[PDB]
Design an enzyme around this catalytic site. Structure first.
Site, PDB file in Angstrom:
ATOM      1  N   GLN A   1      15.062  -4.151  -3.546  1.00 25.72           N
ATOM      2  CA  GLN A   1      14.983  -4.721  -2.187  1.00 25.72           C
ATOM      3  C   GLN A   1      15.154  -6.232  -2.327  1.00 25.72           C
ATOM      4  O   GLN A   1      14.869  -6.780  -3.388  1.00 25.72           O
ATOM      5  CB  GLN A   1      13.556  -4.479  -1.629  1.00 25.72           C
ATOM      6  CG  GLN A   1      13.200  -3.008  -1.515  1.00 25.72           C
ATOM      7  CD  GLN A   1      11.744  -2.715  -1.194  1.00 25.72           C
ATOM      8  OE1 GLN A   1      11.459  -2.298  -0.082  1.00 25.72           O
ATOM      9  NE2 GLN A   1      10.843  -2.884  -2.160  1.00 25.72           N
TER      10      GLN A   1
ATOM     11  N   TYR B   1      -4.033  -4.619   9.383  1.00 23.50           N
ATOM     12  CA  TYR B   1      -3.392  -3.362   8.970  1.00 23.50           C
ATOM     13  C   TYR B   1      -4.097  -2.766   7.717  1.00 23.50           C
ATOM     14  O   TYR B   1      -4.220  -1.554   7.586  1.00 23.50           O
ATOM     15  CB  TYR B   1      -1.927  -3.676   8.658  1.00 23.50           C
ATOM     16  CG  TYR B   1      -1.096  -2.581   8.086  1.00 23.50           C
ATOM     17  CD1 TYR B   1      -0.445  -1.633   8.916  1.00 23.50           C
ATOM     18  CD2 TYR B   1      -0.902  -2.521   6.691  1.00 23.50           C
ATOM     19  CE1 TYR B   1       0.340  -0.625   8.358  1.00 23.50           C
ATOM     20  CE2 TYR B   1      -0.076  -1.551   6.135  1.00 23.50           C
ATOM     21  CZ  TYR B   1       0.540  -0.609   6.980  1.00 23.50           C
ATOM     22  OH  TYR B   1       1.374   0.327   6.380  1.00 23.50           O
TER      23      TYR B   1
ATOM     24  N   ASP C   1       1.308  -4.543  -2.579  1.00 29.25           N
ATOM     25  CA  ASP C   1       0.627  -5.818  -2.426  1.00 29.25           C
ATOM     26  C   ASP C   1      -0.868  -5.699  -2.767  1.00 29.25           C
ATOM     27  O   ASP C   1      -1.514  -6.710  -3.092  1.00 29.25           O
ATOM     28  CB  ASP C   1       0.796  -6.336  -0.988  1.00 29.25           C
ATOM     29  CG  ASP C   1       0.568  -5.236   0.042  1.00 29.25           C
ATOM     30  OD1 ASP C   1      -0.579  -4.930   0.354  1.00 29.25           O
ATOM     31  OD2 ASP C   1       1.564  -4.615   0.484  1.00 29.25           O
TER      32      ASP C   1
ATOM     33  N   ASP D   1       9.105   6.079  -7.508  1.00 29.84           N
ATOM     34  CA  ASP D   1       9.417   6.567  -6.167  1.00 29.84           C
ATOM     35  C   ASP D   1       8.326   7.518  -5.658  1.00 29.84           C
ATOM     36  O   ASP D   1       7.947   8.515  -6.320  1.00 29.84           O
ATOM     37  CB  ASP D   1      10.802   7.237  -6.090  1.00 29.84           C
ATOM     38  CG  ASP D   1      10.952   8.072  -4.855  1.00 29.84           C
ATOM     39  OD1 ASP D   1      10.615   7.640  -3.723  1.00 29.84           O
ATOM     40  OD2 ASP D   1      11.349   9.238  -5.000  1.00 29.84           O
ATOM     41  N   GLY D   2       7.773   7.206  -4.492  1.00 29.38           N
ATOM     42  CA  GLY D   2       6.695   8.055  -3.927  1.00 29.38           C
ATOM     43  C   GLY D   2       7.082   9.521  -3.653  1.00 29.38           C
ATOM     44  O   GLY D   2       6.263  10.439  -3.808  1.00 29.38           O
TER      45      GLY D   2
ATOM     46  N   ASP E   1       1.776   3.694   2.865  1.00 33.16           N
ATOM     47  CA  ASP E   1       1.912   2.290   3.298  1.00 33.16           C
ATOM     48  C   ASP E   1       3.256   1.784   2.848  1.00 33.16           C
ATOM     49  O   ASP E   1       3.394   1.234   1.761  1.00 33.16           O
ATOM     50  CB  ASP E   1       0.785   1.408   2.737  1.00 33.16           C
ATOM     51  CG  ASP E   1       0.982  -0.073   3.050  1.00 33.16           C
ATOM     52  OD1 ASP E   1       1.825  -0.413   3.955  1.00 33.16           O
ATOM     53  OD2 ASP E   1       0.373  -0.917   2.327  1.00 33.16           O
TER      54      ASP E   1
ATOM     55  N   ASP F   1       9.796  -0.186   6.489  1.00 34.85           N
ATOM     56  CA  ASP F   1      10.546   0.482   7.532  1.00 34.85           C
ATOM     57  C   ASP F   1      11.542   1.543   6.961  1.00 34.85           C
ATOM     58  O   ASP F   1      11.913   1.491   5.769  1.00 34.85           O
ATOM     59  CB  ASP F   1      11.351  -0.600   8.348  1.00 34.85           C
ATOM     60  CG  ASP F   1      10.427  -1.554   9.104  1.00 34.85           C
ATOM     61  OD1 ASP F   1       9.730  -1.068  10.083  1.00 34.85           O
ATOM     62  OD2 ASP F   1      10.399  -2.756   8.720  1.00 34.85           O
TER      63      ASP F   1
ATOM     64  N   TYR G   1       4.051  -8.301  12.898  1.00 31.37           N
ATOM     65  CA  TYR G   1       4.983  -7.146  12.854  1.00 31.37           C
ATOM     66  C   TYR G   1       5.719  -7.119  14.202  1.00 31.37           C
ATOM     67  O   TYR G   1       5.223  -7.716  15.182  1.00 31.37           O
ATOM     68  CB  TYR G   1       4.225  -5.847  12.620  1.00 31.37           C
ATOM     69  CG  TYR G   1       3.614  -5.748  11.242  1.00 31.37           C
ATOM     70  CD1 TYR G   1       4.183  -6.385  10.167  1.00 31.37           C
ATOM     71  CD2 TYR G   1       2.501  -4.934  11.012  1.00 31.37           C
ATOM     72  CE1 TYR G   1       3.641  -6.242   8.903  1.00 31.37           C
ATOM     73  CE2 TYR G   1       1.940  -4.783   9.756  1.00 31.37           C
ATOM     74  CZ  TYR G   1       2.538  -5.463   8.692  1.00 31.37           C
ATOM     75  OH  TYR G   1       1.961  -5.342   7.452  1.00 31.37           O
TER      76      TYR G   1
HETATM   77  C1  LIG Z   1       4.387  -4.301   0.876  1.00 33.17           C
HETATM   78  S1  LIG Z   1       3.817  -2.671   1.502  1.00 33.17           S
HETATM   79  C2  LIG Z   1       3.577  -3.101   3.295  1.00 33.17           C
HETATM   80  C3  LIG Z   1       2.890  -4.412   3.540  1.00 33.17           C
HETATM   81  C4  LIG Z   1       1.499  -4.165   4.036  1.00 33.17           C
HETATM   82  N1  LIG Z   1       0.767  -3.509   2.930  1.00 33.17           N
HETATM   83  C5  LIG Z   1       5.379  -1.694   1.684  1.00 33.17           C
HETATM   84  C6  LIG Z   1       5.806  -1.099   0.343  1.00 33.17           C
HETATM   85  O1  LIG Z   1       6.472   0.194   0.465  1.00 33.17           O
HETATM   86  C7  LIG Z   1       7.155   0.324  -0.799  1.00 33.17           C
HETATM   87  N2  LIG Z   1       8.111   1.456  -0.835  1.00 33.17           N
HETATM   88  C8  LIG Z   1       9.289   1.585  -0.130  1.00 33.17           C
HETATM   89  N3  LIG Z   1       9.914   2.712  -0.465  1.00 33.17           N
HETATM   90  C9  LIG Z   1       9.091   3.335  -1.395  1.00 33.17           C
HETATM   91  C10 LIG Z   1       9.175   4.537  -2.087  1.00 33.17           C
HETATM   92  N4  LIG Z   1      10.292   5.407  -1.927  1.00 33.17           N
HETATM   93  N5  LIG Z   1       8.175   4.863  -2.941  1.00 33.17           N
HETATM   94  C11 LIG Z   1       7.144   4.029  -3.101  1.00 33.17           C
HETATM   95  N6  LIG Z   1       6.999   2.861  -2.479  1.00 33.17           N
HETATM   96  C12 LIG Z   1       7.983   2.567  -1.639  1.00 33.17           C
HETATM   97  C13 LIG Z   1       7.834  -1.044  -0.919  1.00 33.17           C
HETATM   98  O2  LIG Z   1       8.234  -1.336  -2.239  1.00 33.17           O
HETATM   99  C14 LIG Z   1       6.789  -2.009  -0.404  1.00 33.17           C
HETATM  100  O3  LIG Z   1       6.042  -2.654  -1.451  1.00 33.17           O
HETATM  101  C1  LIG Z   2       3.976  -2.417   6.837  1.00 27.82           C
HETATM  102  C2  LIG Z   2       5.291  -2.355   7.570  1.00 27.82           C
HETATM  103  C3  LIG Z   2       5.957  -3.693   7.315  1.00 27.82           C
HETATM  104  C4  LIG Z   2       7.307  -3.704   8.009  1.00 27.82           C
HETATM  105  C5  LIG Z   2       7.053  -3.790   9.486  1.00 27.82           C
HETATM  106  N1  LIG Z   2       8.398  -3.897  10.170  1.00 27.82           N
HETATM  107  C6  LIG Z   2       6.324  -2.532   9.851  1.00 27.82           C
HETATM  108  C7  LIG Z   2       5.004  -2.344   9.076  1.00 27.82           C
END
Ligand SMILES: C[S@@H](CCCN)C[C@H]1O[C@@H](n2cnc3c(N)ncnc32)[C@H](O)[C@@H]1O
Ligand SMILES: C[C@H]1CC[C@H](N)CC1
Ligand SMILES: C[S@@H](CCCN)C[C@H]1O[C@@H](n2cnc3c(N)ncnc32)[C@H](O)[C@@H]1O
Ligand SMILES: C[C@H]1CC[C@H](N)CC1
Lengths: 294, 294
Positions: free
Chosen positions: A40, A73, A98, A149-150, A168, A171, A237
């Site tokens: 990303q 959040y 985070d 990957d989740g 968590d 988008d 957000y």
């Molecule tokens: C930073 S966190 C949101 C901010 C408020 N806690 C959103 C995370 O989702 C993760 N994300 C996105 N796709 C995946 C998958 N497929 N698997 C695990 N984590 C993921 C991504 O790397 C961000 O760190």
């Molecule tokens: C946690 C996630 C971060 C991205 C926002 N657009 C929506 C909420």
């Protein structure tokens, strides 16, 4: 896919085709880090000291966290799910690199272990460097922190492993794409124990109400006994709010009233947003969105 | 302070020293009006038709209304106050020249007359031209519309004239300045009847919490028996929310639970945000702000 070009003429502007025609803008004092990760585009800046926002993180151009409002959040996801569960001892966080939801999960004395799995290891590393108050959870003796990957993670996990699963995520555009799908939720249902609770990053009633309608329908149909959307105020957000779908595997559970009120635990007065009054209020929705919960 | 220079590169940017370091931005499709009035800078534009916002109005560079979300604030102010009154028959609206609160107030069958007083005749004129769904109310035979300063109007009003006073103002920078002042609230109290209710444009818990604390204290000081802050979701106001202080002249009145529930009235189903569940929820405040109400 937005990157570096969102910072221009001293401001960050959150322009995105996931919310055409609007953008939240924050003035940039100093860019701390800006780079493509393996997955990303990650940007971290210090916002204007004359405003309250402090440090800001964005992924693929979408604001993730700010120092000023991150507590909302994190608390809502952490405590609304865990206060809905009779004895949450083993918890999984998908995404959350985070450390924010993890910090809130670990305030709970019932929790024996929390696994956290985020696809992007750089989010954990930069969160450690630039958001020490969010990421200090990652070092907790009760946490495991995995890069992966989740979707693959939950598919590799045995039936009946977790009491609570918290999704968590970013988008839907980008590597979170499949985490908003029906096949993923089906696997989430399978790895939950019988009294399992799941909550997610459930998007916006102003911009994504149709997605929210879709998800709540298919999550109920995949076999969750109840799904209720909890609305929360987050200035940074898009459109000033976000919600979470709070889902119970077991029938006859009412997630909209705390099963285990936070007011009985020693850390309640440390919270900045959530308490049992906010828990109950968060499930009342504007008339135009109320069909989600009715 | 701000004028036409807030439109640049196809976008409107709500930059203001009342919220330093941040600005909501909206893409501009067509500018419809943009000029100083006798009192303030008025900008009206059609926003990106790819986004949901429709037509947008700003005064002194602050967004006042958009087609998409205007129903929130107008429903909350009109119905939270009237549903808290045993029988609201005469109502005063200070500000409100767009007609929106007036539209909501006139849904109530108990209302025999509503005076509306706004300093800017050009706002009323442009609202009739560009926002007919908001401003349709202004021609109602039950309304007397006045162009004048709200401060002088209330100072000239006899004691015990009104059942409800609603103070729908711009931010404190500009002609609404003294309407945030203790002298004005003293007069508002005096012109309410003994069971009178007042509510206002009460600003943001994220940007103005000290102002909300001060106002809440002085309004109690001037002799209102109670004051409670109701919080609502409005994407296009700064930080994506705004509040109203809901004030009772008579002791013994719990404004936070509806006295006359809207569900028993014939128009309830026509509303797009407000209902009794939303009314009760609006008074639950995040912990960091809750001292306002407790
Ligand atoms: C930073 S966190 C949101 C901010 C408020 N806690 C959103 C995370 O989702 C993760 N994300 C996105 N796709 C995946 C998958 N497929 N698997 C695990 N984590 C993921 C991504 O790397 C961000 O760190
Ligand atoms: C946690 C996630 C971060 C991205 C926002 N657009 C929506 C909420
Ligand atoms: C547009 S309305 C707010 C939009 C949501 N209805 C705010 C009005 O406050 C009026 N206003 C500001 N100062 C005053 C005074 N002093 N008196 C009356 N009305 C006022 C101003 O002209 C706007 O039309
Ligand atoms: C109604 C009023 C218009 C301007 C905003 N900053 C606050 C709300």
């Amino acid at each position: 896919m937005p990157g570096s070009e969102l910072i221009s003429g001293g401001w960050f502007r959150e322009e995105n085709d996931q919310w055409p025609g609007q953008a939240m803008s924050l003035r940039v004092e100093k860019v701390l880090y800006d780079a493509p990760t393996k997955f990303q585009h990650l940007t971290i800046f210090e916002s204007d000291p004359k405003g309250p926002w402090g440090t800001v993180m964005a992924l693929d151009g979408c604001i993730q966290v700010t120092d000023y409002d991150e507590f909302v959040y994190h608390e809502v996801l952490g405590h609304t799910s865990l206060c809905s569960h009779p004895k949450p001892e083993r918890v999984l966080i998908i995404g959350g690199g985070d450390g924010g939801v993890l910090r809130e999960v670990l305030r709970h004395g019932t929790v024996e272990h929390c696994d956290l799995v985020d696809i992007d290891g750089e989010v954990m590393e930069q969160s450690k460097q630039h958001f020490p108050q969010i990421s200090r959870s990652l070092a907790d003796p009760r946490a495991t922190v995995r890069v992966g990957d989740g979707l693959a993670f939950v598919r590799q996990t045995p039936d009946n492993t977790y009491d609570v699963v918290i999704i968590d995520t970013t988008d839907p555009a980008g590597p979170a794409s499949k985490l908003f799908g029906e096949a993923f939720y089906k696997d989430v249902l399978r790895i939950l124990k019988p009294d399992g609770i799941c909550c997610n990053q459930g998007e916006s009633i102003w911009l994504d109400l149709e997605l929210i309608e879709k998800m709540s329908r298919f999550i109920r149909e995949t076999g969750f006994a109840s799904v209720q959307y909890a609305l929360m105020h987050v200035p940074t957000y898009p459109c000033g709010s976000i919600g979470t779908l709070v889902c119970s595997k077991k029938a006859g559970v009412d997630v909209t009233k705390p099963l285990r009120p936070v007011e009985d635990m020693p850390f309640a007065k440390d919270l900045k947003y959530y308490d049992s009054e906010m828990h109950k209020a968060s499930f009342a929705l504007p008339r135009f969105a109320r069909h989600i919960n009715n």
